[PDB]
Amino acid sequence: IVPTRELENVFLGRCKDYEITRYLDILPRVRSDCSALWKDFFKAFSFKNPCDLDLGSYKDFFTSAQQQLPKNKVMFWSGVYDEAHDYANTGRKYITLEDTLPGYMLNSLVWCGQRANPGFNEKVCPDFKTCPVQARESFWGMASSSYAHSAEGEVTYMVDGSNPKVPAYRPDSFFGKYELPNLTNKVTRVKVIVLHRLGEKIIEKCGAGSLLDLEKLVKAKHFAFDCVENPRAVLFLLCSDNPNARECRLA
Amino acid sequence: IVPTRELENVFLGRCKDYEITRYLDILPRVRSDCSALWKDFFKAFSFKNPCDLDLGSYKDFFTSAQQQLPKNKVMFWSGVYDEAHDYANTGRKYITLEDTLPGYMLNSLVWCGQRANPGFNEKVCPDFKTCPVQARESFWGMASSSYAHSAEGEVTYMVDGSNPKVPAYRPDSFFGKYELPNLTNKVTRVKVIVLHRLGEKIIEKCGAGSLLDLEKLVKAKHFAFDCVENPRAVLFLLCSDNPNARECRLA
Numbered sequence: 001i002v003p004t005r006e007l008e009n010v011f012l013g014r015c016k017d018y019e020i021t022r023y024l025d026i027l028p029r030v031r032s033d034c035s036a037l038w039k040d041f042f043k044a045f046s047f048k049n050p051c052d053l054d055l056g057s058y059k060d061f062f063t064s065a066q067q068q069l070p071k072n073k074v075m076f077w078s079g080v081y082d083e084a085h086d087y088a089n090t091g092r093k094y095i096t097l098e099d100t101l102p103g104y105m106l107n108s109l110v111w112c113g114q115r116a117n118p119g120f121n122e123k124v125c126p127d128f129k130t131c132p133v134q135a136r137e138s139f140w141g142m143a144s145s146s147y148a149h150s151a152e153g154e155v156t157y158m159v160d161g162s163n164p165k166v167p168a169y170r171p172d173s174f175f176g177k178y179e180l181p182n183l184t185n186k187v188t189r190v191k192v193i194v195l196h197r198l199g200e201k202i203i204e205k206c207g208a209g210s211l212l213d214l215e216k217l218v219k220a221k222h223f224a225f226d227c228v229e230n231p232r233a234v235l236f237l238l239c240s241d242n243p244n245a246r247e248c249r250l251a
Numbered sequence: 252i253v254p255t256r257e258l259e260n261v262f263l264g265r266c267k268d269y270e271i272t273r274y275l276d277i278l279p280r281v282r283s284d285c286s287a288l289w290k291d292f293f294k295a296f297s298f299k300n301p302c303d304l305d306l307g308s309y310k311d312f313f314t315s316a317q318q319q320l321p322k323n324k325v326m327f328w329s330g331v332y333d334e335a336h337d338y339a340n341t342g343r344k345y346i347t348l349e350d351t352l353p354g355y356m357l358n359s360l361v362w363c364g365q366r367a368n369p370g371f372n373e374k375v376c377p378d379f380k381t382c383p384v385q386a387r388e389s390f391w392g393m394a395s396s397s398y399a400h401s402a403e404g405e406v407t408y409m410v411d412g413s414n415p416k417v418p419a420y421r422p423d424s425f426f427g428k429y430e431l432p433n434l435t436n437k438v439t440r441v442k443v444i445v446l447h448r449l450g451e452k453i454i455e456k457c458g459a460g461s462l463l464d465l466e467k468l469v470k471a472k473h474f475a476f477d478c479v480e481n482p483r484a485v486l487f488l489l490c491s492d493n494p495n496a497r498e499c500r501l502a
């Protein structure tokens with residue numbers, strides 16, 4: 001893959017944009033300057049081989065960047081990026097990882113270290129499936145970890161019950177690796193939302209299969225559990241993109 | 252009412268981020284670099300009294316910042332900012348002025364000039380309703396003119412039909428002053444979408460009142476014209492937010 005151009009400029013620009021104007025009524029301000037943020041972020045990967053990284057490489061950066069999160073509002077998702085963020089509504093109904101400072105600064109960006117000056121690669125970045133797992137998941141794994149760790153009260157989980165090749169809940173998702181195991185006794189309940197893509201064969205159902213596994217894990221953390229399939233407000237979102245579906249017919 | 256802090260840094264940060272990462276498949280890059288853009292912007296109001304502006308003050312800036320816009324995808328809106336932007340879907344279905352470079356950089360921001368150094372006011376910005384209309388509307392009126400002037404093919408206009416106090420179409424709106432009068436022969440059609448808020452009395456309908464005036468006005472310029480109220484895809488977005496309304500009763 002081709003690395004993002006003028007990485008420092010984009011980082012510092014999104015950082016200043018967010019600081020002054022984004023989520024002011026929804027998430028608290030970070031306590032560090034954007035230059036200090038850049039400095040911890042850069043020294044995490046710079047002057048090293050693109051696969052030298054591990055789960056600790058970005059710890060100082062995420063310590064500098066972490067935000068206290070609104071009780072009851074935190075959302076996780078697997079397999080339904082577009083639907084979860086549409087439904088979250090840019091922080092107004094739920095908060096996602098992407099609404100917090102570090103997700104919003106690096107969302108979609110591409111970067112990597114090298115050993116010669118200037119210590120990063122402007123030309124090429126390795127396909128990351130070529131690195132050991134602790135290295136290919138250094139950044140986004142620690143991100144999901146801090147984030148889950150800060151969740152309080154109710155949390156929400158959106159998933160896909162229409163995928164014949166991917167279970168609604170997998171222990172090897174980012175949610176299963178990093179999120180679920182990191183939630184504290186400050187969390188009280190897990191509310192799952194199963195998406196049935198319209199026009200398509202239903203594959204997972206509440207309490208059966210991987211959702212029944214998930215249920216048992218959640219109760220084992222002494223957390224409450226509920227699960228619903230196409231709740232009306234979410235169904236209406238889907239229907240808007242496919243107003244003809246049989247599921248969408250009105251009285 | 253307080254002015255945006257670190258205006259220049261916010262402006263430049265937003266400009267750089269948009270340049271490198273935003274709308275890359277949806278809209279073209281402008282030729283002019285960020286510091287050249289800043290120049291043109293700042294000379295418009297700097298070192299003059301706050302109400303010492305007119306429609307031609309920001310002219311060089313908008314000249315520099317204007318993008319060609321993709322055919323059939325331009326949308327206008329009155330009275331329904333949230334609903335129109337949700338439905339336009341960040342450029343994926345329709346483009347709005349807030350998706351273009353100059354609208355993206357200045358959206359939500361607050362600034363004004365002053366005669367003394369630094370040439371702009373960091374303390375307060377006169378309740379712009381204090382100023383002659385050509386000063387109060389110098390920036391966003393010129394933004395709207397330039398945007399409308401660039402539109403091709405079909406264009407769409409989303410309006411409020413439940414406001415007893417404010418008609419669907421008004422000659423004194425930004426659409427009536429700046430946008431409709433500036434559409435060129437490159438535009439072939441104007442498609443109106445009338446929004447009826449759930450559970451609010453319906454005030455305006457296609458073919459009556461101000462919408463009738465709008466139809467004739469649009470017939471004069473030799474565009475086609477259609478109009479529709481609460482079409483399904485828009486209606487479902489509304490129900491998503493108020494699933495229990497009578498209009499959202501499922502069969």
Ligand SMILES: NC(=O)c1ccc[n+]([C@@H]2O[C@H](COP(=O)([O-])OP(=O)(O)OC[C@H]3O[C@@H](n4cnc5c(N)nc(F)nc54)[C@H](O)[C@@H]3O)[C@@H](O)[C@H]2O)c1
Nearest residue numbers: 076077078079080081097098136137140144173174175176
């Ligand atoms: N914002 C994020 O990017 C982000 C990333 C990971 C986890 N999160 C947290 O964990 C859950 C989403 O991961 P999930 O439960 O695994 O659900 P998914 O739909 O499978 O998403 C993986 C897809 O993202 C793409 N991806 C991006 N970067 C990478 C990366 N370094 N490495 C890899 F492998 N994939 C990446 C990749 O193409 C892959 O196809 C959410 O609760 C979220 O808070 C957010």
Ligand SMILES: Nc1nc(F)nc2c1ncn2[C@@H]1O[C@H](COP(=O)(O)OP(=O)(O)OC[C@H]2OC[C@H](O)[C@@H]2O)[C@@H](O)[C@H]1O
Nearest residue numbers: 326327328329330331348387388391395424425426427430
């Ligand atoms: N000088 C000003 N500067 C700024 F930033 N905002 C202003 C100013 N004056 C009034 N406003 C606010 O700006 C809003 C004017 O909105 P509506 O009335 O809802 O629709 P319309 O008038 O047609 O103007 C929206 C249409 O103009 C171009 C755009 O692409 C779309 O086609 C009002 O809600 C009002 O609170």
Ligand SMILES: NC(=O)c1cccnc1
Nearest residue numbers: 348358359391392395425
């Ligand atoms: N975004 C705005 O404030 C705005 C105001 C007037 C016209 N167009 C946009």
